[PDB]
């Protein structure tokens, strides 16, 4: 089960000595809803071929989201492409607050609570690149502590330890219910 | 430009000791001798702008050194300015 | 552990490098010193890296991995072809088709075509076609047989890729990192170290050292093949 979405459809054109040659380009985002993200950019002369190319490229290119239970770990300032997209977690149930392309990519990621803002070049392609880079910039507390050579309690806050323990207990309960 | 004879004469004659050379007293002495000599030259040579640049640079340098002397000690500043007979 | 000895390596001149006009400063921590404008490779880290490569290759061959041999320089073509045809392992020695490992579904059709052409030629039908297209098909036999040696025998896609002289063979290692396949290659004084996962210090420009390194890795592969 994968989540599919389309963000923008553009009628690109090419010129020859005879006249105008039209073409179609599409960008799609694929995700499993658990924290696995794939982006695809596909070009054709017709929408079905375009979306097929986009889906294939997205299937080729994947990326994993290290989310804590339901939300993001820490605020991230994703500076890439030409747009500035700033992501940070929030209180559970607040919702994934983001623009169009960011909305699509985060919903395909499966996150449920995020605060986002795009600060320039509202173009969908650049926004998607900036969000992907923002997720790449994300760091996870366990291997952050491993890199720093200091144990978890001496690195990460007790509140996020409590949240992680609650998330682990909920995941264990869900696994038990699914097995039974 | 000053040469060895008069320059060593000046550094010794306004020196605190017979060995020190970089003292502010000797520095100001060299700057003053240079400026009077070459100002006498520029009283004849009028349109030497590249040398008037040297005038202004050495004078600002002098002003910084005199400010340092006044800051570090009022008595030495007054003695220096009185022995050279200038205004400031 | 190692098989080749220090005096043998020195005699083969595996420690040499290029001139001072070609070395990239990414080899500073591998280069020991310079004499007569020629850079030398560092022996002890060379041994550590070849030992790690030996461990990796024995592991992958024991677990059943496919390793493609890559080398196109005029000096090493014969050596790589000979050792690969004796060990029975797929190799590429003359022409590297762009993205043949990445774009495998396209070259699979032409492997099918070449096998079909071999089957039809072995039947003996030559006078049933005009001599013009007979000559054309013989020429395309020559071309494709000359440029395609390893995909005849690999089929089932590789598990590791081994390359010589990566600065000229950047296409193969680039495809290898793009597909995620582990890379083992010889890095000279002018090569990027992050390109190869398991670098093996040495010379691609000296036939003695090239032949010895290829024989050592072929012996490792043979040992793994007996060890399955």
């Amino acid at each position: 089960n994968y989540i599919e979405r389309v963000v923008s459809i553009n009628r690109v054109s090419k010129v020859v000595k005879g006249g105008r040659r039209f073409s179609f380009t599409a960008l799609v985002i694929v995700g499993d809803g658990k924290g696995m993200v794939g982006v695809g950019y596909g070009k054709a002369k017709e929408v079905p071929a375009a979306i097929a190319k986009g889906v294939e490229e997205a299937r080729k290119n994947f990326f994993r989201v290290p989310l804590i239970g339901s939300t993001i770990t820490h605020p991230v300032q994703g500076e890439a492409a030409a747009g500035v997209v700033m992501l940070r977690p929030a209180s559970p149930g607040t919702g994934v607050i983001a623009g169009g392309a960011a909305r699509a990519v985060l919903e395909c990621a499966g996150v449920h609570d995020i605060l986002a803002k795009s600060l320039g070049s509202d173009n969908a392609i650049n926004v998607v690149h900036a969000t992907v880079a923002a997720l790449k910039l994300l760091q996870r507390p366990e291997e952050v502590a491993a890199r720093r050579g200091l144990p978890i309690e001496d690195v990460a806050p007790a509140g996020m330890l409590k949240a992680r323990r609650e998330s682990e207990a909920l995941a264990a309960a869900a696994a038990r219910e699914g097995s039974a | 430009a000053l040469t060895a004879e008069q320059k060593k004469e000046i550094l010794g004659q306004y020196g605190l000791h017979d060995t020190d050379t970089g003292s502010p007293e000797a520095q100001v002495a060299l700057l003053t001798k240079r400026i009077q000599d070459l100002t006498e030259h520029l009283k004849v040579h009028k349109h030497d702008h590249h040398s008037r640049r040297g005038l202004l640079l050495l004078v600002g340098r002098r002003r910084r050194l005199l400010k340092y002397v006044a800051q570090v000690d009022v008595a030495r500043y007054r003695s220096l300015i009185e022995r050279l007979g200038l205004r400031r | 552990m190692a098989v080749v000895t220090m005096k043998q390596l020195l005699d083969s001149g595996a420690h040499f490098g290029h001139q001072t006009r070609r070395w990239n400063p990414k080899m500073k921590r591998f280069i020991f010193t310079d004499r007569n404008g020629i850079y030398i490779i560092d022996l002890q880290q060379t041994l550590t890296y070849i030992d790690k490569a030996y461990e990796f290759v024995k592991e992958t061959v024991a677990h059943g991995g496919t390793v493609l041999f890559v080398g196109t320089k005029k000096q090493a073509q014969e050596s790589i072809a000979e050792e690969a045809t004796r060990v029975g392992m797929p190799y590429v020695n003359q022409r590297w088709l762009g993205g043949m490992l990445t774009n495998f579904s396209t070259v699979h059709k032409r492997l099918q075509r070449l096998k079909e052409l071999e089957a039809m030629e072995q039947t003996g039908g030559f006078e049933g076609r005009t001599k013009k297209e007979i000559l054309m098909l013989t020429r395309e036999k020559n071309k494709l047989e000359r440029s395609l040696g390893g995909i005849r025998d690999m089929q089932k896609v590789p598990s590791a890729v081994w390359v010589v002289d990566t600065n000229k063979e950047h296409i193969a290692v680039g495809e290898a990192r793009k597909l995620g396949i582990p890379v083992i290659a010889i890095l000279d004084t002018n090569c990027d170290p992050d390109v190869v996962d398991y670098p093996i210090p040495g010379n691609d420009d000296a036939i003695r050292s090239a032949a010895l390194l290829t024989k050592v890795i072929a012996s490792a592969v043979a040992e793994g093949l007996q060890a399955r």
Partner: protein, 131 residues
């Protein structure tokens, strides 16, 4: 001119991290020394030791690298600088990297880390964000 030793130190350290260097030599000072001390205590750096030079004391800092070569330092930036000096009260201690980073705060005890500073309830000027 040479006008900010702490910013110069932070920039040289993060430039060395970007350039994958291992050892950096800087002029020694108490601020540099105890900042290196708190860096060692938190574990972002490997180790430091002082030396003697042609003129005065100098401190060398060895960067930290792991088996997989990824940087042990993500980025540095200074918030309190000559001119714009920013300070924090006892309740508005800055949160860096969602609490996963470290802010260096000079309190009545000294240059101490933000978490234990909030534990003590003490506060002051934030030196830099290290994450």
């Amino acid at each position: 001119t040479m006008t900010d030793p702490i910013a110069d130190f932070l920039t040289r350290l993060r430039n060395a991290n970007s350039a994958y260097h291992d050892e950096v030599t800087l002029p020694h000072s108490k601020l540099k020394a105890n900042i290196a001390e708190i860096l060692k205590r938190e574990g972002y750096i490997s180790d430091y030791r002082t030396e003697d030079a042609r003129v005065g004391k100098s401190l060398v800092v060895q960067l930290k690298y792991g088996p997989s070569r990824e940087r042990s330092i993500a980025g540095l930036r200074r918030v309190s600088k000559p001119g714009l000096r920013v300070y924090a009260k006892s309740t508005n201690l800055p949160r860096v990297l969602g609490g996963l980073g470290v802010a260096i705060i000079s309190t009545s005890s000294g240059l101490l880390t933000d978490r234990q500073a909030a534990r003590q309830g003490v506060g002051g000027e934030v030196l830099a964000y290290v994450w």
